[PDB]
Write an enzyme that holds these catalytic residues in place. Structure first.
Site, PDB file in Angstrom:
ATOM      1  N   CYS A 107       0.924  -0.935   0.148  1.00  0.00           N
ATOM      2  CA  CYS A 107      -0.112  -0.047  -0.056  1.00  0.00           C
ATOM      3  C   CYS A 107       0.956   1.217   0.049  1.00  0.00           C
ATOM      4  O   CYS A 107       1.156   1.921   0.988  1.00  0.00           O
ATOM      5  CB  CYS A 107      -0.719   0.093   1.121  1.00  0.00           C
ATOM      6  N   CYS A 110      -0.115   4.610   1.926  1.00  0.00           N
ATOM      7  CA  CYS A 110      -0.252   4.566   3.262  1.00  0.00           C
ATOM      8  C   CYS A 110       0.004   3.237   4.035  1.00  0.00           C
ATOM      9  O   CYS A 110       1.298   3.097   4.213  1.00  0.00           O
ATOM     10  CB  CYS A 110      -1.862   4.867   3.445  1.00  0.00           C
ATOM     11  N   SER A 111      -0.963   2.536   4.195  1.00  0.00           N
ATOM     12  CA  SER A 111      -0.436   1.267   4.892  1.00  0.00           C
ATOM     13  C   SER A 111      -1.570   0.159   5.128  1.00  0.00           C
ATOM     14  O   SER A 111      -1.703  -0.703   6.138  1.00  0.00           O
ATOM     15  CB  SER A 111      -0.244   1.701   6.333  1.00  0.00           C
ATOM     16  N   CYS A 112      -2.616   0.064   4.183  1.00  0.00           N
ATOM     17  CA  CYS A 112      -3.879  -0.629   4.239  1.00  0.00           C
ATOM     18  C   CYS A 112      -3.478  -2.185   3.826  1.00  0.00           C
ATOM     19  O   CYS A 112      -2.618  -2.727   3.289  1.00  0.00           O
ATOM     20  CB  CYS A 112      -4.692  -0.255   3.077  1.00  0.00           C
TER      21      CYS A 112
HETATM   22 CO   LIG Z   1      -2.756   2.464   3.253  1.00  0.00          CO
END
Ligand SMILES: [Co+2]
Lengths: 203, 228
Positions: A107, A110-112
């Site tokens: 991701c 972000c960090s999904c």
């Molecule tokens: Co993310």
């Protein structure tokens, strides 16, 4: 990396702690945050939702050709068959590793990650180093960082989850596991194997 | 926005830091930071897309090296102030108070069964962003499309590395909340969503892996037809 401008980790932690406790006190007075709410969210992801859930999906797919088809057809619906799903995993698309293809998820924006099957992601997955490099030099990154060498001739498909669709890797079943039980097979499935940075455990 | 947070393809960020094993929460403040997500969401501080936009507006230097959950705290404050639900001056005073008195108690408060109910429902029921729209999908599997070169100053999910690049539609997932409006307080305005495939050579030129492709999700407005 070294940054001569950065405070010590101890000082950073002390400052954050105070800032968070201050913000917490305000949200509490507003009546929108409580200690039981905090403890409940924490217990759910510290003991209830984790990668062991994804493993259950993987082993069922490994031992049930039909379930596997359903899983690849509609991830969210298939996982619901096992009571698996929920927050940040509302839309899942599973992709299968084969001898001709290897999948790796990231991701960059972000960090999904699909919490329902993988739980909260380890910090490296959320950090800039992995996110920036994996879409640009996936083969080298896999070799250098995870000691995972993917032959040049084997295609690497990098899935950048920029939407709410969550991509999950269905790792290939390790050789030498014929007739193994779902419980025995599960010992080979790792969070990393479902992200694609590592294959399922050998032997 | 063309923020530093959009790191895909960035060089020089350094080797990955990966301990052999780590806890879900490294410190008590992280648990609090985490729980504040459903709390502020329920309170109307922001939606998921706006939540992300708040983090995207962080000081780049701070974002690149601060603990992940600190990003969450920044966005809470950002929206608390934006919506006028948080008084910055009071927050600053309390921060100093807790700096000098770290073990001071939190405000007395009553527990609320409805907040626990919210948590369980959101965790197990989820917060689906899928929506139905009246218009049919503009594209389909096999279509060759080009990613927009627009550069919105507000929130959007347009990684700089895919802009202006050509790829092939891999799958239509139906319609979902549109970031470009939702993240900017302009509503869900759902758009059809597609996963598009871009070869490494298209993305990185000769320096790209000769046998690799990147799959990126694109909302309908993000792409235009090249070849059906
Ligand atoms: Co993310």
């Amino acid at each position: 990396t070294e940054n001569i401008l950065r405070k010590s980790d101890e000082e950073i932690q002390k400052e954050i702690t105070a800032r968070v406790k201050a913000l917490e006190s305000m949200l509490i007075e507003q009546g929108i945050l409580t200690t039981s709410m905090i403890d409940r969210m924490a217990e759910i992801y510290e003991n209830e939702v984790g990668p062991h859930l994804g493993a259950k999906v993987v082993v069922k797919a490994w031992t049930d050709p039909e379930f596997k088809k359903r899983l690849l057809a509609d991830g969210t619906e298939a996982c619901k068959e096992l009571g698996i799903g929920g927050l940040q995993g509302e839309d899942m698309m599973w992709v299968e590793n084969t001898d001709e293809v290897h999948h790796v998820v990231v991701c960059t924006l972000c960090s999904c990650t699909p919490w329902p099957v993988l739980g909260l992601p380890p910090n490296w997955f959320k950090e800039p180093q992995y996110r920036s490099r994996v879409v640009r030099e996936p083969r080298q990154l896999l070799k250098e960082e995870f000691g995972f060498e993917v032959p040049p001739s084997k295609e690497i498909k990098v899935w950048d989850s920029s939407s709410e669709m969550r991509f999950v890797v269905l790792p290939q079943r390790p050789a030498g596991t014929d007739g193994w039980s779902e419980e025995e097979l599960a010992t080979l499935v790792t969070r990393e194997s479902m992200i694609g940075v590592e294959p399922a455990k050998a032997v | 926005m063309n923020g530093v947070y959009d790191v895909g393809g960035t060089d020089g960020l350094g080797p990955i830091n990966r301990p052999a094993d780590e806890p879900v929460f490294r410190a008590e403040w992280e648990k609090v930071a985490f729980a504040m997500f459903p709390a502020t969401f329920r309170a109307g501080f922001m939606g998921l897309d706006e939540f992300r936009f708040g983090i995207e507006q962080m000081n780049p230097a701070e974002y690149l090296e601060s603990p992940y959950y600190w990003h969450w705290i920044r966005t809470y404050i950002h929206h608390g102030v934006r919506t006028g639900k948080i008084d910055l001056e009071e927050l600053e005073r309390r921060t100093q108070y807790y700096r000098e008195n770290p073990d001071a108690p939190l405000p007395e408060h009553e527990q609320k069964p409805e907040l626990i109910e919210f948590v369980n429902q959101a965790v197990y029921g989820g917060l689906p962003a899928s929506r139905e729209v009246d218009r049919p999908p503009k594209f389909k599997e096999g279509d060759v499309v080009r990613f927009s070169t627009a550069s919105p100053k507000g929130h959007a999910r347009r990684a700089r590395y895919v802009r202006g690049k050509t790829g092939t539609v891999v799958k239509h997932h139906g319609a979902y909340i549109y970031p470009d409006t939702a993240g900017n307080g302009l509503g869900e305005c759902p758009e059809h969503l597609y996963t598009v495939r871009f070869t490494a050579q298209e993305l990185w030129g000769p320096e790209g892996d000769p046998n690799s492709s990147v799959y990126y999700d694109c909302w309908e407005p993000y792409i235009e037809l090249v070849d059906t």
